[PDB]
Amino acid sequence: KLVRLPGLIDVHVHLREPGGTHKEDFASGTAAALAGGITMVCAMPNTRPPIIDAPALALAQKLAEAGARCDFALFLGASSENAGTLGTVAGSAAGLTLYLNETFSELRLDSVVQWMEHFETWPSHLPIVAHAEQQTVAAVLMVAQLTQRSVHICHVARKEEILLIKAAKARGLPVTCEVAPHHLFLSHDDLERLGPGKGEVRPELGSRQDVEALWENMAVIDCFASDHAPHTLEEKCGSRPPPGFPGLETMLPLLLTAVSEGRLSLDDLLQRLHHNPRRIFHLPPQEDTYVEVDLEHEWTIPSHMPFSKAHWTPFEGQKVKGTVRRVVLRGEVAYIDGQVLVPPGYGQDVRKWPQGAVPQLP
């Protein structure tokens, strides 16, 4: 007997198109999404060219409309030069992404004053997400309060970070956050097996105490999001390994295993992969869309999943219980038992739907 879930949403993926299409493209990344029970993705802007102005966004929109197999929204990225220039296209994006630490990106902001400028000029009703680690979480929360608006913290990975966010929420501050599966299911104990190249990720893998702190503070976690960050094995094992793990195809099976073990409820999972993503990013419903999962099937994660061009996974050898059997997207069968059945281009930009615009005061 299968369980029917709504269409799940991943608010943090890297689809690498344009400019890194040997790692992933819209067609291969959205195939990975559908196979992981994900029917809508929000794509980060750290591509080549990065999505930091209107021409780059226009190019990315057309590439996604032609290649995506599931529905999507595209983030804009903050730069040292584009504050105050995005007003005409801001509403067409998933939100604005601030890169506040070192990671796979050249979108460096090197002064808090630049963060302030973005918080002041970006329209106040639209989402802002931040790559902000350790004390940077406190710093960006300060900038959000100075400018009297909300912020969403990407991939929280540490006891320090989740407890700071917990304290902010207790004071009534408008902050939300997401946690990626590798920070719930991997730790320092796995670095010997992975090695220093494969093991490179930002935020880095945490201690066992970090992992335990995230589970203990699940009530503080608003969303799960994969931070699907594909790189080839050659790149991961080469002289200057880029950080990041692929994760779309393994996220839901890992979390279904935890549900089966009683670590969180099915509702806890659906809040964090459906309802809270919808409400934080004002993402629209998807008509006639659902995911059927088999919670009984036991299997072991192989050395690579079928669809991501990354062609490797850090979860190799983990035993999971739960698998995606079928996905229906807007009335068409999109995935069944390892076969993707919608072509590149089937997916649409949800911000162009009338119900996908963020409401605002005139």
Ligand X SMILES: NC(=O)N[C@@H](CC(=O)O)C(=O)O
Binding-site ranges for ligand X (CB under 6 A): 14, 46, 103-104, 131, 201-202, 227, 229, 242-244
Q: How far apart are CA 154 and CA 227, in angstroms?
A: 9
Q: How far apart are CA 352 and CA 349, in angstroms?
A: 6
Q: How far is the CB of 126 from its own copies (least distance, A)?
A: 10
Q: Which of 70, 42, 55, 17 is nearest to 333 (CA)?
A: 70
Q: How far is the CB of 103 from Zn ion (least distance, A)?
A: 5
For the window 213-242, what string marks contact with its own copies as x by the rule CB under 8 A?
----xxxx----------------------
Q: How far is the CB of 42 from its own copies (least distance, A)?
A: 17
- Interstrand relation of 339-340 and 71-74 (parallel, antiparallel or unpaired): unpaired
- CB closer to its own copies out of 64 and 214: 214
- Amino acid letter at 175? V
The reply on whether position 270 binds its own copies by CB under 8 A is yes
Which element (helix H / strand E) includes 113?
A: helix 112-121
Q: How far apart are CA 242 and CA 231, in angstroms?
A: 7
- CB closer to ligand X out of 79 and 121: 79
Q: List the interface residues with its own copies, window 45-74 (CB under 8 A).
A: none
Residues in the chain after which the backbone breaks (C–N beyond 2.5 Å): none
- CB closer to ligand X out of 7 and 20: 20
The reply on whether position 1 binds its own copies by CB under 8 A is yes
Q: List the interface residues with its own copies, window 147-186 (CB under 8 A).
A: 166, 169-170, 172-174
Q: How far is the CB of 265 from ligand X (least distance, A)?
A: 28
Q: How far is the CB of 293 from ligand X (least distance, A)?
A: 27
Binding its own copies by CB under 8 A: which of 138, 233, 266, 336? 266
Q: List the interface residues with its own copies, window 111-150 (CB under 8 A).
A: 125
The reply on whether position 361 binds its own copies by CB under 8 A is yes
The reply on whether position 275 binds its own copies by CB under 8 A is yes
Which element (helix H / strand E) includes 339?
A: strand 339-340
Q: How far apart are CA 174 and CA 152, in angstroms?
A: 9
Radius of gyration of the chain measured on its C-alpha atoms: 19
Q: How far apart are CA 190 and CA 82, in angstroms?
A: 40
